[PDB]
Design a protein around this motif. Sequence first.
Motif, PDB file in Angstrom:
ATOM      1  N   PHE A   1       0.911  -1.342  -0.039  1.00  0.00           N
ATOM      2  CA  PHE A   1       0.160  -0.268   0.305  1.00  0.00           C
ATOM      3  C   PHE A   1       0.983   1.212   0.114  1.00  0.00           C
ATOM      4  O   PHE A   1       0.917   2.238  -0.884  1.00  0.00           O
ATOM      5  CB  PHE A   1      -1.072   0.062   1.193  1.00  0.00           C
ATOM      6  CG  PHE A   1      -1.834   0.790   1.439  1.00  0.00           C
ATOM      7  CD1 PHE A   1      -2.249   2.063   1.726  1.00  0.00           C
ATOM      8  CD2 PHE A   1      -3.653   1.260   0.724  1.00  0.00           C
ATOM      9  CE1 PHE A   1      -2.491   4.005   1.904  1.00  0.00           C
ATOM     10  CE2 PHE A   1      -4.231   1.699   0.851  1.00  0.00           C
ATOM     11  CZ  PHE A   1      -3.680   3.202   0.970  1.00  0.00           C
TER      12      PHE A   1
ATOM     13  N   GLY B   1       2.227   1.685  -3.304  1.00  0.00           N
ATOM     14  CA  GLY B   1       1.889   2.083  -4.236  1.00  0.00           C
ATOM     15  C   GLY B   1       2.102   0.808  -5.591  1.00  0.00           C
ATOM     16  O   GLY B   1       1.964   0.253  -6.677  1.00  0.00           O
TER      17      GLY B   1
ATOM     18  N   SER C   1       0.221  -2.094  -7.076  1.00  0.00           N
ATOM     19  CA  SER C   1      -1.162  -2.919  -6.647  1.00  0.00           C
ATOM     20  C   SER C   1      -1.891  -3.893  -7.570  1.00  0.00           C
ATOM     21  O   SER C   1      -1.984  -4.896  -6.775  1.00  0.00           O
ATOM     22  CB  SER C   1      -2.067  -2.137  -7.910  1.00  0.00           C
ATOM     23  OG  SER C   1      -1.465  -0.404  -8.008  1.00  0.00           O
TER      24      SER C   1
ATOM     25  N   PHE D   1      -0.429  -5.692  -3.899  1.00  0.00           N
ATOM     26  CA  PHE D   1      -1.524  -5.824  -3.054  1.00  0.00           C
ATOM     27  C   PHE D   1      -2.452  -6.661  -3.209  1.00  0.00           C
ATOM     28  O   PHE D   1      -2.576  -7.122  -2.384  1.00  0.00           O
ATOM     29  CB  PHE D   1      -2.334  -3.609  -2.802  1.00  0.00           C
ATOM     30  CG  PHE D   1      -3.178  -3.418  -2.293  1.00  0.00           C
ATOM     31  CD1 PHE D   1      -4.189  -4.232  -2.464  1.00  0.00           C
ATOM     32  CD2 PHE D   1      -2.137  -2.827  -0.781  1.00  0.00           C
ATOM     33  CE1 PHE D   1      -5.536  -3.520  -1.154  1.00  0.00           C
ATOM     34  CE2 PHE D   1      -3.458  -2.828   0.370  1.00  0.00           C
ATOM     35  CZ  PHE D   1      -4.904  -3.143   0.596  1.00  0.00           C
ATOM     36  N   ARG D   2      -2.489  -6.980  -4.450  1.00  0.00           N
ATOM     37  CA  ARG D   2      -4.154  -7.402  -4.499  1.00  0.00           C
ATOM     38  C   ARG D   2      -3.677  -8.910  -4.116  1.00  0.00           C
ATOM     39  O   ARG D   2      -4.548  -9.912  -4.013  1.00  0.00           O
ATOM     40  CB  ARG D   2      -4.735  -7.543  -6.012  1.00  0.00           C
ATOM     41  CG  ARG D   2      -5.317  -8.094  -6.682  1.00  0.00           C
ATOM     42  CD  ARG D   2      -5.950  -8.289  -8.542  1.00  0.00           C
ATOM     43  NE  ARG D   2      -4.317  -8.721  -9.680  1.00  0.00           N
ATOM     44  CZ  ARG D   2      -4.049 -10.281  -9.140  1.00  0.00           C
ATOM     45  NH1 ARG D   2      -4.965 -11.159  -8.680  1.00  0.00           N
ATOM     46  NH2 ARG D   2      -2.567 -10.558 -10.267  1.00  0.00           N
TER      47      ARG D   2
ATOM     48  N   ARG E   1      -3.439  -9.206  -0.151  1.00  0.00           N
ATOM     49  CA  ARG E   1      -5.043  -9.197   0.382  1.00  0.00           C
ATOM     50  C   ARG E   1      -5.458 -10.546   0.039  1.00  0.00           C
ATOM     51  O   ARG E   1      -5.960 -11.462   0.837  1.00  0.00           O
ATOM     52  CB  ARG E   1      -5.331  -7.723  -0.680  1.00  0.00           C
ATOM     53  CG  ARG E   1      -7.222  -8.284  -0.386  1.00  0.00           C
ATOM     54  CD  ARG E   1      -8.025  -7.251  -1.582  1.00  0.00           C
ATOM     55  NE  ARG E   1      -7.998  -8.440  -2.715  1.00  0.00           N
ATOM     56  CZ  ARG E   1      -8.392  -7.779  -3.938  1.00  0.00           C
ATOM     57  NH1 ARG E   1      -8.493  -6.734  -3.877  1.00  0.00           N
ATOM     58  NH2 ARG E   1      -9.009  -9.184  -4.842  1.00  0.00           N
TER      59      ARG E   1
ATOM     60  N   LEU F   1      -7.733  -0.896   4.640  1.00  0.00           N
ATOM     61  CA  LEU F   1      -6.553  -0.327   3.213  1.00  0.00           C
ATOM     62  C   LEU F   1      -7.526  -1.057   1.969  1.00  0.00           C
ATOM     63  O   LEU F   1      -6.941  -0.497   1.352  1.00  0.00           O
ATOM     64  CB  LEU F   1      -5.062  -1.067   4.028  1.00  0.00           C
ATOM     65  CG  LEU F   1      -4.603  -0.681   4.844  1.00  0.00           C
ATOM     66  CD1 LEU F   1      -3.343  -1.151   4.627  1.00  0.00           C
ATOM     67  CD2 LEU F   1      -4.750   0.643   4.961  1.00  0.00           C
ATOM     68  N   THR F   2      -8.190  -2.322   1.954  1.00  0.00           N
ATOM     69  CA  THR F   2      -8.457  -3.361   0.660  1.00  0.00           C
ATOM     70  C   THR F   2      -9.347  -1.924   0.584  1.00  0.00           C
ATOM     71  O   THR F   2      -9.388  -2.181  -1.092  1.00  0.00           O
ATOM     72  CB  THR F   2      -8.730  -4.595   1.314  1.00  0.00           C
ATOM     73  OG1 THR F   2      -7.992  -5.161   1.532  1.00  0.00           O
ATOM     74  CG2 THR F   2      -9.948  -5.066  -0.018  1.00  0.00           C
TER      75      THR F   2
ATOM     76  N   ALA G   1      -7.920   0.914  -1.291  1.00  0.00           N
ATOM     77  CA  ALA G   1      -7.410   0.625  -2.005  1.00  0.00           C
ATOM     78  C   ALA G   1      -8.158   0.364  -3.566  1.00  0.00           C
ATOM     79  O   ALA G   1      -7.751   1.272  -4.633  1.00  0.00           O
ATOM     80  CB  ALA G   1      -6.539  -0.158  -2.417  1.00  0.00           C
TER      81      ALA G   1
ATOM     82  N   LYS H   1      -1.029   6.651   4.879  1.00  0.00           N
ATOM     83  CA  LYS H   1      -0.066   6.488   4.816  1.00  0.00           C
ATOM     84  C   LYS H   1       0.907   7.082   5.822  1.00  0.00           C
ATOM     85  O   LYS H   1       1.498   5.659   6.179  1.00  0.00           O
ATOM     86  CB  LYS H   1       1.044   6.329   3.450  1.00  0.00           C
ATOM     87  CG  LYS H   1       0.924   5.593   2.231  1.00  0.00           C
ATOM     88  CD  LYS H   1       0.965   6.581   1.231  1.00  0.00           C
ATOM     89  CE  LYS H   1       0.445   5.701  -0.837  1.00  0.00           C
ATOM     90  NZ  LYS H   1       1.425   5.362  -1.784  1.00  0.00           N
TER      91      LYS H   1
END
Lengths: 191, 191
Positions: A29, A32, A34, A37-38, A41, A68-69, A72, A164
């Motif tokens: 997160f 950045g 992505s 992160f995906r 998660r 955070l999910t 985002a 952040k």
Amino acid sequence: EDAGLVAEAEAVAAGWMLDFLCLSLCRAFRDGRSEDFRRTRNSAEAIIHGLSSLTACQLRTIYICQFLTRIAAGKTDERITPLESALMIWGSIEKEHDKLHEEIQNLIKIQAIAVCMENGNFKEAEEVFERIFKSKLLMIISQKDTFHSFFQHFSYNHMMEKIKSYVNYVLSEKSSTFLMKAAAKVVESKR
Amino acid sequence: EDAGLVAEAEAVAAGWMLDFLCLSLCRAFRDGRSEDFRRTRNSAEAIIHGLSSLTACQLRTIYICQFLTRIAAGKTDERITPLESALMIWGSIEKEHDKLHEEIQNLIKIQAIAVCMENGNFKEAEEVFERIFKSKLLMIISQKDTFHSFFQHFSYNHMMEKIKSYVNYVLSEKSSTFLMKAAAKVVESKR
Ligand SMILES: COCC(=O)NCc1ccc(C)cc1
Ligand SMILES: COCC(=O)NCc1ccc(C)cc1
């Protein structure tokens, strides 16, 4: 082999995996990243199905991850938007309601409306406004005044910057958890 | 903070989580704990997206997990059945083709047909037979002779028993992997 002791060891390991994946989710997160992160998660979401009982610390960990999910997915079975869902989690996490908490809360409240205006969905912006909340903000939405000076102080970038800074505190608090500490030792031994 | 060293520690931890989840998947398969198997399978599937490069040992681990996933779905974007997919994985795993390998192979080949007959789908049983493979087996399918003595030697129970003996070897080989060993120590300290 004792079935109860094997199940207990699986629950201990699920707890270690949850902290490790929270730390990875926080860094992705912050950075950045992505796609990372995906992936993190999805792994954290699957791993916590291995837990049917959570301590207060573990509940805070999963709620930070769910929060955070939603943040985002902010611009992307509930009849509310992701930022509205993030606001619900934020207002119920067992945590101090300090100045930083309130700053993040108000930035999400205004950005939940502003992201709809950015996407050109002003009807949804009004529906979001009605669910969250005044006459000045409704005139702004009605006039499609997306770049009103109010939205420049309560901006998306300011919301992300404040979130952040909160993430950096979670990151430092969990940087010494078992799995990352043991993994860093292995990497440092090579180098 | 070095981004490369953080990513390396995440890959080390993903490797530890993969072995731990393989061990849990093996025990759930052995015990017949279907819901625990489904949860572990989903966690292992998600975790391995964190790995883009695998050693020979890790490839064997993921293929054992994919193989057990198909065997567990045996009676439940490919135009083949789960037991046919298990047979493809079984015949390509980097492993010794000993007597036990061949025994499991032949039991899956016959059960891939027999599970279709059990479900009353004899057209699929013939389609499975055509893809895998003789005149005696096709007469059995054509006659809907589900309880022919051939199927009683090459039974579903015999297939599961032989696969479970193979699982016990995987289970013993991975019982000393890092995460389960450290988790068992924590449980033993309480207790
Ligand atoms: C509850 O709604 C689904 C959701 O928020 N999934 C992301 C998720 C990520 C990480 C954890 C620990 C838990 C959940
Ligand atoms: C590749 O087809 C999907 C599938 O087999 N999922 C179950 C699965 C379980 C465990 C691991 C490590 C990997 C996969």
